[PDB]
Amino acid sequence: CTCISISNQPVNPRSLEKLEIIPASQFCPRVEIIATMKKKGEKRCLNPESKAIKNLLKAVSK
Template sequence: MSLITSVALLVFLTIHEASSVGDQGLNLRCRCINKENKPIGRHILLVEVNPANSHCTDIEIIATLKKDGLKVCLDPDAPWVKKVLQRKLGQTL
């Protein structure tokens, strides 16, 4: 095999591996860098809670907004966020 063919094969295999890891939905880092502290409870459509894990030591609370579907990270220590979580979890039970 020529050098160019070998390099092309390695590039192809690397791209294939990267796409298969991405397809599994693995998060290898924290998603929330900035966290919202201001109360926005009435604008929240959906709440997603990601527990701490080996890739991110923080609990991440991600809210999807009603108006535009924007995802916003919430401060899990804020009292209003705890109330929103109780209300949203109460609806699903």
């Protein structure tokens, strides 16, 4: 897929420009949570398993 490497690193919501979620397609057996950081626009993936993701979305809501 798009992630060459998933990250277990925490990401502070307030540093999120746009969070992207791409459910398992027909040519990518697995979920993909790509975060796009503000500064520099750093793009890194997120381990779908990690627990903080299980609430990072609820965060980017307000």
